Every structure is written in structure tokens, then in C-alpha cells.
Write a protein that binds this DNA or RNA. Structure first.
Ligand SMILES: Nc1ncnc2c1ncn2[C@@H]1O[C@H](COP(=O)(O)OP(=O)(O)O)[C@@H](O)[C@H]1O
Ligand SMILES: Nc1ncnc2c1ncn2[C@@H]1O[C@H](COP(=O)(O)OP(=O)(O)O)[C@@H](O)[C@H]1O
Ligand SMILES: [Mg+2]
Ligand SMILES: [Mg+2]
Lengths: 615, 603
DNA sequence: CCCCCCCCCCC
DNA sequence: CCCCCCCCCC
């Protein structure tokens, strides 16, 4: 055998099984003569035979590929297939429900990819990674973990036959450290890319950097039809395949805006839509507790021939399946913005859009990364509207004016432009992504804030530069707390004083806009109402007192009597619920990390010492 | 800033986790070979900063150490100081006691109270992944902590751990898989081998490797936890390690022998009527729940169906299935008004603690893996349990006095049984054993420190079959056997090696369904290559007729035929468990029957 | 200027 | 014949 017969048979082997051999033959031409590297040429070919056997095993295990006929991606798959075949990067943009997420991996398989390497397929959320993987496996009549596997936090079903591997973008970023060239994959699908989270942008930057060193790798950026040109120019003017099928125009009804109920507008819209022809209603909510209160309210009403279905992140597998079951009458679906573009709620014809969303945004006033509930962008509101366009005569009720909509900015800020650089640097450092200033971002953060973010991380003990940024074990712990680094540092210090509960209450409060209102009209009853929670020692302790006051009285009152209590005590109902959501999410993360949380409230003595760590 | 030395830096390694201490120690050993003292100093100055960094991981873990409490009612809780002192002062301890003592849930706490679990993890093995997850959830609950925190678990497909995990529940197979990336098991300062009396290949492999390992791991402590079945064998293995017997008071159980009268003349009705007669006999006794042992889940379903047709007064029939919901999985520990009859397999013999059981009914059988020399196949027959097992089943109604275990066989039948179950190592074909050791890197089978070595006359035969199948290959000086890609795929199939090769070959041709049909039929006794087609066609016919008529009407069909419904049921049972294993390995199975003679080329 | 591998493996 | 240190690499 010659050097060419062994080099060219590697192109049949797996990607990982071609690296250890192709640059392995170069060692054979080095020790300075043959007749010992002519018998090694014969014996390393035995290993090349056994390698190609696993390729044939994977081929023998590939299922027959089928597609639902009713999906635009199914109908248009030939154009998509030729675009993927002929370009290293393709932007696939299409209306929600076109079949991008469930059919794109199949098209990659039909094209022959996924044998010599895996087709990695990222999602923003673990629930979507798992749910998508079950669905494709089922469409192909396979078991999850066979041809279609998945890898999320706490759950990893990827066998030796797996060709498509669903995962969260977070999961894919964490694998770079161990596999700098991502050699496990021949194809990578970045899905829901229009969310422009830090994770997505981290992947888009890293992949663009990686491409020159991976001529065999193919990239498919999959997203809603929202300024996809930006993805295109980033990947050196990669083609954009717009895969939207037929969509019908949607009627937009504007329903803008002392004892009026907070949810009264939603009740009105619900009753109005109930008078329309059959079709389910999708209601966009700002969070889980808002969805809970709204489901409880709508049930109290006993809407005739109407069933209420709240989409919680904590929904069991039994509940998630009822979303796609046939149902008798009219169904009202309550969801956060996950069903905006990511989820595909079936049977939807009418939408109620309060117009707000929880979004991560750094406050220069408070010096804190926060989660303001602010009006959504036009592009975001148009996605919510678009969910009615699957059929004709869809109705979208917007709980705001037309002037308001026209005024709102066109697009949503990508997370990279609304996050303090300390958080960004910490994640990059934790992921081994390199120096923030040389990273090929799609859109770069403000370079003038890099030094401030580096100093903060040092002052917090998160990194070691006294050049060569390294995480400290404390820093590794901060990077896993999804709140502002300064606030998270305080939480980590509270565990040494047995007041993590209070640290999380205070952190939660500081991560939102002040729930204590003070309108122009009264300006005195609001002040006297909130003075019931002043603490002589610190402004922060007022939040703990207000927190304990709120907890006791959601127990003494019903869900409806509570909302009256909020406007009775000049408290923002939505912000209170958000305060409760964030604390719950934070408490679950903290406890999963083994950080001790005090059961009984720790007195205001040890809370002082722990507070004086942040700044 | 100032001069550092080997002595100073080495003294700081002891503030570190054993992993870090080992690494830095070997890094310092290298610096002893550096001829340039300036270079040594520079390395020291750098290494000292990293030691400072690494020592912080210990402080974070200490900050997460939970407060330890013990249920007052448990014998292990009541003897915790004696247990704690034995663990402290010995490198290996054998903790043996009746089921329900609190060995599984309280031992990991005891190690944490000793101070272990910080510089290394307390690994805790189980034979079943469900047990590993369930125990970790339980201890975490008892400690008022979230699973994945200080108490975590790692099983196939589900890893709930964190940087602060101190106790790590896992299957013994998970621990064995970790050996080839950590030969010293430096992740752990403590390893608890639970249910050790089951004497599976996995357990014996761990006991063998642990015994080899201990001289290289003076900072490691081992706790062998088992039922009270010949624990002196474990003691002798680990150089006469002390045995701490943690049972509470012993409450003798009354044994009634009720050999099955062949009154109906039907083997399946005759057994059901024996269970009915046992249930009657027991309901004439003081209040108490009944635990009926079964050999499979198909048997549980049929027997539970039968007992319900009886219209029993104020009695609930609770079947225990492996795939039970976490809702139905909870009710077994909850209060009930009347009498409850619980049907379970031998998972309820020693591993599980079904509460409130005063009476036991024991048919005396279980599925056991045993290599048949006649057929040259590793079979999974139902066979009479050992005396040790039947006493374990009897023990499960001895929580208080006046327990009654009814044995559906005679005393002579009981005495004819062997004193102990054969350990798996002594009833498994050597080809499977050698394959499994080679996949794990456990070394030559003739030098492995087995608790009980297999008969070495079979070793060369096993190597031959594994060479013929293409699972292994010998190399440079015929000193170590090495695995091939095919053999690794064979390592993952819990069936006979020759049958396993067939399953993989069926994957090429889309007839893994048929390969499983043949495989499960060969691992049992028939209800009756051209012979294998009879297996498939019988299977297909039975499946169709099973969906055609009711469950009751289907039993009438088997008896109006030269077919035994019991063997049919065990065939379907084995197949189902086989299909579950195949699916978890990502091997595709055809839905429709493979077309004719598509299997010929696969045999 | 320290640590470890193959028949994809480590101090 | 083939690679590595922030526990990495043909
Ligand atoms: N798990 C599921 N069960 C039933 N139907 C589903 C499931 N997932 C997706 N679908 C349906 O398949 C269609 C395609 O959805 P998807 O592939 O997510 O499209 P896109 O990613 O373009 O929004 C949708 O209309 C949806 O209703
Ligand atoms: N999952 C569980 N739910 C509720 N109680 C349990 C659970 N597991 C164990 N227990 C209680 O703890 C006791 C101790 O059981 P265990 O620690 O498994 O003892 P052993 O391992 O010695 O059989 C049991 O008898 C039971 O009362
Ligand atoms: Mg999608
Ligand atoms: Mg136990």
C-alpha cells in the first residue's frame, strides 16, 4: 500500500477517526527510512478497516427519511437540500410553523450528513431540546436516543448510532473546552437564532472563527424572518433561504389600557374572541405566576365550552402532550414568549397580546443587570400577531394603542448590547472563549466598558489577573448564578453567614423595577403605605419586610383578593409576581448547587456582615 | 516573593482534594528532575498560586456541608456511633443487617459526620439505576436538601451532581466504567458497595478491583453493605475486615408450608388457587398487609388481575412495577384504610422496604442467569430460589412479632434447595466474563482477585469464542487481550455472546425484532436454522390472536392448542425486557415483522 | 519552566 | 505511526 491509498480511504472514516490517521501518516514519513514504515503501513490499515466498519454500522442504522406533506419545509426541501449541499453556511429563515426545527435535521440526513459526524442542533431551552428530539424520533418511527438523541442538563441520551443530537446552545458552548475543533459534528444547526442571546452570539462568533479550520463542517443558522441579512453578512454573505409557506393577513384590534382589575383587559378580550368562529386563543403572559393567576381567574368564570391550558416550564410530560391533542370546543392557551416563535401551539387563530415581556437589561441608574418588564419591539409584536396567520381571518387583539405600536423600536436589542461587560467576560472566561476584544462578535459590546468589567470581576474574586484571565473556584460559582455578578457575589457570601434566603430576596428585588408605586395623584397614601416596611438599618432590609408581608397575605387572601391588595397597597401586581418568579427560580438554582438556604429567617444581625461584600 | 521549597509546598497538598493533591504531588516530583534551580523556583511560585486556588474548592465544599440528622426509629441510627467508630478506625468494614435497618439511607450520612465527602466523594453503588436515583432523592429529602446538591446521583442517561456533591449514588456499573479514566478512583475518599450480597459480576468485579486498589489508596475507605448472608466471605476477602451487624431485635417468623395441590390439574390455575388459599388463611389472622413475591411483571399483572376479580373485602391490590409512575411509586409508602396486598418481584427481597408488611406469600421462584451446557447458551430460567433467598423473603414480614410467611412448597422442597445462591461469576459463561473484564480494563482473568474464581478450565474456550466472533485480538507478546470495535458493541448487550453477535447482525437487515424473538425464546423453555423460523411464526401468530380477543379469551386459545400459556407469558416477558435494553443502546427495531428469509442471511 | 497516555489513550 | 494542561490531546 502507498501513502495515497491509505490517505484517501480516510475520507470514508468518521471525522474523529480521520484526524488520528491523516496526521498520523505524517509521522510515518518522518523517521528516516522505509521497510519499517512499510510494515506499519500494512498494520495500521487493519485499524482503518475496523474504523470504516463503524461508518457502515451507522449507515445500516439510518432510518428511512419521511416528511409531513403539510409543512412548507417538507414541500421546499429540495431547494434547502441543494443550498446546504453547496454552501458551508446557510441561513434558513421562515415563519413559525414552517417545519424548520423538526424537518431541517432530516434534510441534513437525506443529504448524507450525520454519518461521519453528528448533526448538532441547539435550542435556547432544555425543554425544547428534549421535546424536539422526541418528535423527530417519533416522526421517523425511531426511539429517542437512537438516530435522534439529545443532551441537556441532567439528561443525556446519545448512543453510538445517534446521527442528530439536540441540545441547548449552552450545552454546545460547554463542549468547546473539551473539543476545540468540535470534531464530534459534521453539521451544526443554531436554532431560534433570532433570539440573539449571549449563548447564540457566542456560538455564532466561535463558529465563524472555527470555519477556516473545519472545511468539512456545515453550519445552518435557523431563525424567524427577522433581519436575517445580518446573519448573512456575518458569515461572508451566506445564502438566505426564506421557507415561509402561505400566510393570511391578520386583523389587528387595538384595545389600549381607579379600581379597575389588572387582568380586566384580558377578560374583555377573551369574551370578545369567544364570540368569533371556532379557533383557539393564545394569550401572551409575562411570567409563570401571572399565567397561574390568569388560569385561576378564567376558570372561576366557567367560560362555556372553553378549557384553559397554561404552558408552564414545569409542565409534566402528561400535560405537554395535551397541547397537541384534539380537543372538543374552544381552548385558551396561556404562555410566555416561548410560544412566540419557539413553541408552535396548534389550532391557534386568535391572539391576545398584552405587549410586554421580561428582558435582561443593565441599568446604569442602579448598576445592576435587571429584568425589566418593558414593551416589546415591533418585530416581537409582529411575531405574536403572525401566529394567527396560519389560517384566514385570524384576529390579534393588542392591549395597547396603534400610536404606541408605531412608536416602539423596530427590532429587539440583542443581549450582547444590553448586558454589563462583567457578566459577558465571566461567561466567556468560564467557557474558554478567549479575549473579549478579539472575539468575532456579530455585534460587538462597547469596548470602552471592558476594563470596568475586568476590574469588577477582579474585585469580586471571580478571576485571576493578579493578561491571562483565569476563573477562580469562586468565579466558577458566580458564573452559575443567573443574576448580576455583584448580587451573586453577595449571595455566595451569605452562605457563610446563614442568610442566603434573605440574600435571594434582596437580590430578587434589586433585579426588577421597584414594585412600590408612588403615583402623581395620591403621593401621600403611597408613601404611608410603603413606610410600613422601612428598616432603620438598611434600605435593603425593607425588601425583606415587604417580602414577609406579601407572603403572609397571599395566604390570608384568595388570588383575586390578593390583586386588590396590590392596588390597595400601591404595589405593582406584575412586579410582585415577577419578584416571586425570580426568587423561586433563584432558590431552585441555589439549592441545586448545594448552597445552604436558611429555613427560618436569619435575624438582621448576620445580614449586615454578608451585605458588606458587594460594594 | 520569597523562597519556596519542596517540603513547604508538599505540606500544603494536604489542604486539597485528593485529586488535586495527587496531581500537584506528581508535578512536584517532576520539579525534582529540573536541574535549573531558578526554573524550580519559578515553577514553585506559579504552583503555589494554583495550590492557593485549588484549596478554595475545599472551602466551598465545606460551606455546603449539611447538618446531619437520623431517624430515631432505625437500628442504624441507634448504632451510629459504633458504625462511625468502625469506619473511622478501619479501612474496610462489612456492615450487615436485615432489610429495613437503615443501611442504605443512613450509612452515607455517617461518613459525612466522620468528615468524609469533602476532600473526596462518598461513592455509593446500587445494582439498579432506579435504586440509585431513589436513594439519592431520599437522603437529600431527609437532609432537607435538593438532589444534586450535597447528595447527588449518576446513572445511565441522568447525571444529577454538582461541584458540591459529597455523596454520589450510582450503579455499580457506572463506577466500573469510571475506572478506565481514573484508575486510583481519586474522585472518591469513600466507596459504599450496596446490596453486595447479590454477588453479581459487577459487584465481584468491584470487590476484586477494590482489594487490588487499597494498597495504592491509603486515604480510601471501603464499606461493604449487604444482607445477613455469609458476610464472613466478604470479611475474609478483605483480610478479615470487621463485621458490624446492624439489625435490631429479631422477631421470629412463623413458616407455613403449603405445597401447591394440583387440584385443577392446570399449572397456572393451580398456582393462582394456592395464592387464593394463602390469602384466605392469612385474612383469618390479626390485621396486616400481605407481600406476595413474583418472578416477573407479567406474572404480577395476571395475579393482580386475578385477585381483583375476587371482590375482596376492604382490600387493595397494589402491584409494584419497575416502570411505575412516580405517583403510584409514592402510594406504596402512604397510609391506607383497610388491608393492602402488595405484589412484587425480588426487588422487594432485600433492596426495597415495603412498609407495613406483616405476612408474606412466597412461590419460591425467580429469574436467574445460568449458563446451560446442553444448549451452550446463557439462559434466564425461572428456578427455585436458594434457602438464603427464601429466608430473606421470609424476613420481610419480621418487622414486629407474629409475622407469618406462607411458602407455596413443602419443607422437603425448601431443604432440597442449596444453602446459598450461586454467585453470578460461577454461573456465567467465561466468554461473557472475559469480554466484560476486557471492556473495563480489569486485566487478566487468571490474576484477578475474585471473591470466588470461575473454573479456569473454561478460560481458553471463552477466548476462542471471543476471537471467533471478532471481539478480541492478542498483540505484541501475547501478554494482554485487546478489544475490537465489534467486541465493544458486544460488551453492551446483556445476552449470550453468540446471540449478541446475531442481534448486531440483525441490525444490518432490519430484523432486530426477529433476533430478539429468537434470543428470548432460547433463554427460556419453549411452549412446544429452520427451527428458528418456527419461533418467529409462533410469535407472530400469538401476537395477532392476542390483539384479536380479550385477555380472558386469549387464555382459552392457548389451552385449545398444544401451547402453554405460562411459557408464552415468560417468552413475552423476556422479550420485552430485551427490547428495553436494545432501545437504550440506540439499536433500531422493526415495527412490522421482517419479510420472509430476510433473516436467513442474518443467521 | 513541573504532570500523563494509545492500538481515542493520561499524570 | 499520532497528540495535550486553566484536568489538557493526534
Ligand atoms: N411535539 C409535537 N407534537 C405534535 N406536533 C408538532 C410537535 N412539534 C411540532 N409540531 C407541529 O409541526 C409543525 C412544525 O413545527 P416546527 O418544526 O417547530 O416549525 P418551525 O420551527 O418552523 O416553527 C408545527 O405546525 C407544529 O404544530
Ligand atoms: N424512598 C423512601 N420513602 C420513604 N421512606 C423510606 C424510603 N426509603 C427508606 N425509607 C425508610 O427508611 C428505612 C430504612 O431503609 P434503608 O435505609 O433502605 O434500610 P436497609 O438498606 O438496611 O434496608 C425504611 O425501612 C423505610 O422506613
Ligand atoms: Mg423553530
Ligand atoms: Mg439497602
Amino acid at each position: 500500500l502507498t501513502f495515497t491509498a491509505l490517505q484517501q480511504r480516510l475520507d470514508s472514516l468518521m471525522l474523529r477517526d480521520r484526524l488520528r490517521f491523516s496526521r498520523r501518516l505524517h509521522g510515518v514519513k518522518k523517521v528516516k527510512n522505509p521497510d519499517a514504515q512499510q510494515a506499519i503501513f500494512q498494520e495500521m490499515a487493519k485499524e482503518i478497516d475496523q474504523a470504516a466498519g463503524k461508518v457502515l454500522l451507522r449507515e445500516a442504522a439510518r432510518p428511512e427519511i419521511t416528511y409531513p406533506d403539510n409543512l412548507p419545509v417538507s414541500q421546499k426541501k429540495q431547494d434547502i437540500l441543494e443550498a446546504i449541499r453547496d454552501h458551508q453556511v446557510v441561513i434558513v429563515a421562515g415563519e413559525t410553523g414552517s417545519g424548520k426545527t423538526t424537518q431541517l435535521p432530516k434534510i441534513c440526513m437525506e443529504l448524507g450528513r450525520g454519518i461521519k459526524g453528528l448533526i448538532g442542533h441547539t435550542q435556547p431551552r432544555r425543554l425544547a431540546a428534549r421535546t424536539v428530539a422526541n418528535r423527530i424520533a417519533e416522526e421517523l418511527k425511531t426511539e429517542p436516543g437512537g438516530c435522534i438523541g439529545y443532551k441537556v442538563r441532567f439528561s443525556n441520551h446519545v448512543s453510538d448510532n445517534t446521527m442528530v443530537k439536540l441540545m441547548t446552545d449552552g450545552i454546545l458552548l460547554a463542549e468547546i473546552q473539551q473539543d476545540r475543533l468540535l470534531m464530534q459534528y459534521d453539521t451544526i444547526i443554531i436554532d431560534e437564532a433570532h433570539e440573539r442571546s449571549l449563548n447564540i452570539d457566542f456560538l455564532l462568533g466561535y463558529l465563524k472563527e472555527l470555519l477556516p479550520r473545519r472545511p468539512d463542517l456545515k453550519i445552518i443558522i435557523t431563525s424567524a424572518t427577522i433581519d436575517p441579512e445580518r446573519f448573512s453578512r456575518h458569515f461572508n454573505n451566506a445564502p438566505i433561504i426564506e421557507v415561509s409557506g402561505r400566510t393570511y393577513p391578520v386583523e389587528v384590534r387595538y384595545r389600549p389600557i381607579t379600581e379597575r382589575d389588572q387582568l380586566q383587559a384580558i377578560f374583555d378580550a377573551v369574551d370578545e374572541l369567544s364570540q368569533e368562529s371556532p379557533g383557539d386563543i393564545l394569550i401572551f403572559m409575562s411570567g409563570e405566576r401571572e399565567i397561574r393567576d390568569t388560569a385561576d381567574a378564567l376558570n372561576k368564570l366557567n367560560l362555556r365550552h372553553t378549557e384553559i391550558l397554561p404552558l408552564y416550564a414545569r409542565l409534566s410530560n402528561s400535560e405537554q402532550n395535551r397541547v397537541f391533542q384534539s380537543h372538543s370546543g374552544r381552548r385558551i392557551v396561556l404562555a410566555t414568549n416561548v410560544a412566540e416563535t419557539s413553541l408552535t401551539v396548534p389550532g391557534i387563530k386568535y391572539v391576545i397580546d398584552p405587549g410586554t415581556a421580561r428582558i435582561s437589561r443593565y441599568s446604569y441608574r442602579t448598576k445592576v443587570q435587571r429584568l425589566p418588564i418593558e414593551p416589546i419591539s415591533q418585530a416581537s409584536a409582529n411575531q405574536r400577531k403572525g401566529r394567527c396567520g396560519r389560517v384566514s381571518e385570524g384576529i390579534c387583539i393588542r392591549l395597547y394603542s396603534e400610536d404606541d405600536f408605531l412608536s416602539r423600536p423596530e427590532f429587539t436589542d440583542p443581549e450582547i448590547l444590553r448586558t454589563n461587560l462583567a457578566s459577558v467576560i465571566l461567561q466567556m472566561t468560564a467557557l474558554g472563549l478567549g479575549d473579549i476584544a478579539a472575539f468575532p462578535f456579530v455585534e460587538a459590546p462597547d469596548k470602552r466598558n471592558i476594563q470596568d468589567g475586568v476590574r469588577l470581576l477582579e474585585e469580586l474574586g471571580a478571576i485571576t489577573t493578579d493578561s491571562a484571565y483565569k476563573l477562580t473556584p469562586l468565579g466558577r460559582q458566580l458564573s452559575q448564578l443567573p443574576v448580576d455578578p455583584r448580587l451573586a457575589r453577595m449571595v455566595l457570601e451569605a452562605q457563610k453567614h446563614g442568610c442566603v434566603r434573605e440574600a435571594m430576596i434582596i437580590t430578587s428585588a434589586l433585579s426588577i423595577q421597584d414594585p412600590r408605586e408612588r403615583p402623581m395623584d395620591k403621593q401621600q397614601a403611597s408613601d404611608e403605605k410603603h413606610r410600613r416596611f422601612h428598616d432603620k438599618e438598611s434600605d435593603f432590609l425593607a425588601f425583606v419586610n415587604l417580602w414577609n408581608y406579601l407572603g403572609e397575605q397571599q395566604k390570608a387572601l384568595s388570588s383575586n383578593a390578593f390583586r386588590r391588595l396590590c392596588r390597595t397597597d400601591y404595589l405593582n401586581y406584575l412586579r410582585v409576581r415577577e419578584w416571586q418568579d425570580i426568587y423561586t427560580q433563584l432558590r431552585q438554582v441555589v439549592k441545586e448547587l448545594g448552597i445552604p438556604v436558611n429555613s427560618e429567617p436569619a435575624e438582621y444581625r448576620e445580614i449586615h456582615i454578608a451585605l458588606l461584600t458587594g460594594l
